[PDB]
Write a protein that binds this ligand. Structure first.
Ligand SMILES: Cc1cc2nc3c(=O)[nH]c(=O)nc-3n(C[C@H](O)[C@H](O)[C@H](O)COP(=O)(O)OP(=O)(O)OC[C@H]3O[C@@H](n4cnc5c(N)ncnc54)[C@H](O)[C@@H]3O)c2cc1C
Ligand SMILES: Cc1cc2nc3c(=O)[nH]c(=O)nc-3n(C[C@H](O)[C@H](O)[C@H](O)COP(=O)(O)O)c2cc1C
Length: 609
């Protein structure tokens, strides 16, 4: 029954939709597709592949008229989402015969990235190779345009093709309107109420391994200090105690945390809607046959839902604004909301500008449209789930097996909406003061940002500002290896900053590593000081000769990390120029050479946006 197949049989499901999602876009699509099954007299369920063994696809043919659908997002360099990692690894190893398996894939991607929808394309071609039968063309959603309409366009052709394949047709029955109904609990034991846990009730208090996305380990914050000298920004370094969790990690991996929305913002929303946030309740699916019993962990209070389970800071979706329109008592306001939710060009234009680019959130919409008074229960099923935030672990498990370090800048800005916005996780992390204990629900997500297999292999690290994070772990580890008597190749760091007196992160630590010979070269650039701005790509260019040697003769591995995609672009272009000059070779040939390094695993990236 731990098999998704047996799980399906239990509830008479013939359609299962797996989601490879990291920020919830794919998950929601899977939820919608699963729900769609019903409009055709069939039954589906959405599912997190991480919770199952996809090799069980082999038993799916046991279910008559069964179909498996995949909504998969592609991340850094074509890599899968954290929750789809095991499925991806398995697909590459397996040679199982999937004859009799019917599938369809909808990929979530973005054309501006080099590996557009790589995950979607991989899963679709791989399943066919294994012998499964494609029932509908691969969908290629592009978030650089309008992912929603791509999904809608695919979906509208998908269902008729599936209904036809399985012999059914639309029922054309009631639309439903709302997906959940409100059930208040006048009296209820405190023991039955969720207080912020993600998986099993009281799983936060009764910490029991193994710990992962659905069972986060509450790590104690043992250190939380200010890294920068300035006052205009707040860069911080934190250390999370993972002792006794059995959680394993390596330099280059990521640590995800489930934050808590600002208590004051939660209060405001409750107040503007005139509701008692301390009311305990449950939202139950109107359709008793749906597998999605509740929108989030219930029973729980409105306060807890808004604080731990819901996204109340990002721009509300167009469908949310459409639904909200019916609650605006003022015509002009109702109409404005519809125009913003519409597909017209003016409508899209307005939404893009006034909602998205101005970074307005659910509270702002509520204040901006005072005639808008929706019941809080209906609002909660319209809001998206609060997502975990990922950070590059800045420590080496070889040196800190029981502690995971984080390096991050606190997010705070004046939005064009005229309000000040606060990053959800960084504001929450910033307030976590060591010593009861300040606990951070977290889990580790493996990455492929790994130090070379052989210690002798040279290492080149490029990263500006906070992008230095994973490299503190790398340097910690390389230094450790030297102490252990190993033969370690050169270790070079090309770091960029604004000012050495504003934000020159880890000065002391780097100086010590360099003095010990752990850090072969320490190259630092400051971009904000006089018209003459120096960036990391300039540091690389000034060191063209030595870098070419390490790359062409030394077999060095390259690593780039930072929050700016254009930074990675400029760094990459700089390496193209170095290869072109020292090969020597034509630019076009230099490009191929660098990309080859990437496919050969010698040029890794970790860009956060
Ligand atoms: C694999 C991976 C690794 C990462 N590693 C790190 C790391 O080591 N360190 C680190 O600091 N971060 C890292 N990030 C970024 C991190 O996940 C968080 O997004 C970031 O810390 C802010 O989260 P928040 O919850 O505080 O902000 P949120 O509340 O989620 O807000 C962030 C959003 O606000 C908007 N925004 C921000 N500033 C502005 C502005 N001036 N104007 C308009 N809109 C704005 C953007 O749309 C942005 O997406 C990583 C991301 C990924 C995907
Ligand atoms: C750090 C990061 C890296 C990404 N890398 C790629 C990529 O290589 N290729 C691609 O097609 N889309 C890429 N995308 C776009 C996502 O696939 C797209 O935004 C998707 O919708 C996110 O879905 P989710 O919310 O279900 O994770 C990336 C997005 C982020 C945030």
């Amino acid at each position: 029954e731990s098999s998704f197949v047996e799980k399906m049989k239990k509830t008479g499901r013939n359609i299962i939709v797996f989601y490879g999602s990291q920020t919830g876009t794919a998950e929601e699509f899977a939820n919608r597709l699963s729900k769609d099954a019903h409009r055709y007299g069939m039954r589906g369920m959405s599912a997190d592949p991480e919770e199952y063994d996809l090799a069980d696809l082999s038993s799916l043919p046991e279910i008559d008229k069964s179909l498996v659908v995949f909504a998969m997002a592609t991340y850094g360099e074509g890599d899968p989402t954290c929750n789809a990692q095991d499925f991806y690894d398995w697909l590459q190893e397996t040679d199982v015969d999937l004859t009799g398996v019917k599938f369809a894939v909808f990929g979530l991607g973005n054309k501006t990235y080099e590996h557009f929808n790589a995950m979607g394309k991989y899963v679709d071609q791989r399943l066919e190779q294994l012998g499964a039968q494609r029932i509908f063309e691969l969908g290629l959603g592009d978030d650089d345009g309008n992912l929603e309409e791509d999904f809608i366009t695919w979906r509208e052709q998908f269902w008729p093709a599936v209904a036809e394949f399985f012999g059914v047709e639309a029922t054309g029955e009631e639309s439903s309107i709302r997906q959940y109904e409100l059930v208040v609990h006048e009296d209820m034991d405190v023991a039955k109420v969720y207080t912020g846990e993600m998986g099993r009730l009281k799983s936060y208090e009764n910490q029991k391994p193994p710990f992962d996305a659905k069972n986060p380990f509450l790590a104690a914050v043992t250190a939380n200090r200010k890294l920068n000298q300035g006052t205009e920004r707040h860069l911080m370094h934190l250390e999370l105690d993972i002792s006794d969790s059995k959680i394993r990690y390596e330099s280059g991996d990521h640590v995800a945390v489930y934050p808590a929305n600002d208590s004051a913002l939660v209060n405001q929303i409750g107040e503007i809607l005139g509701a008692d946030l301390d009311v305990i309740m449950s939202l139950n699916n109107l359709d008793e046959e749906s597998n999605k019993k509740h929108p989030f962990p219930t029973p729980t209070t409105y306060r807890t839902a808004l604080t731990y389970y819901l996204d109340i800071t990002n721009p509300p979706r167009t469908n949310v604004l459409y639904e909200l329109a019916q609650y605006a008592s003022e015509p002009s306001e109702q109409e404005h909301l519809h125009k913003m939710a519409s597909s017209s060009g003016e409508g899209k234009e307005l939404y893009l500008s006034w909602v998205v680019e101005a970074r307005r959130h659910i509270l702002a919409i509520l204040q901006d449209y005072p005639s808008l008074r929706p019941p809080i229960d209906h609002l909660l099923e319209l809001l998206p789930r609060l997502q975990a935030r990922y950070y590059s672990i800045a420590s080496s498990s070889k040196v800190h097996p029981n502690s995971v370090h984080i390096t991050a800048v606190a997010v705070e800005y004046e939005a064009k909406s005229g309000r000040v916005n606060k990053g959800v996780a960084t504001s929450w992390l910033r307030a976590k003061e060591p010593a009861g204990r300040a606990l951070v629900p977290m889990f580790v997500c493996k990455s492929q940002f790994r130090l070379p297999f052989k210690s002798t292999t040279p290492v080149i690290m490029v990263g500006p500002g906070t992008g230095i994070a994973p490299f503190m772990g790398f340097i910690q580890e390389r230094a450790w290896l030297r102490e252990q008597g190993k033969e370690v190749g050169e270790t070079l760091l090309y770091y960029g900053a604004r000012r050495s007196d504003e934000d020159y992160l880890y000065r002391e630590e780097l100086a010590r590593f360099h003095k010990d010979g752990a850090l072969t070269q320490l190259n630092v650039a400051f971009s904000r000081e006089q018209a003459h701005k120096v960036y990391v790509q300039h540091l690389l260019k000034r060191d063209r000769e030595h870098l070419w040697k390490l790359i062409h003769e030394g077999g060095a591995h390259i690593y780039v990390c930072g929050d700016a995609r254009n930074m990675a672009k400029d760094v990459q272009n700089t390496f193209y120029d170095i290869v072109a000059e020292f090969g020597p070779m034509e630019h076009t040939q230099a490009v191929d050479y660098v990309k080859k390094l990437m496919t050969k695993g010698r040029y890794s990236l970790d860009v956060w946006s």
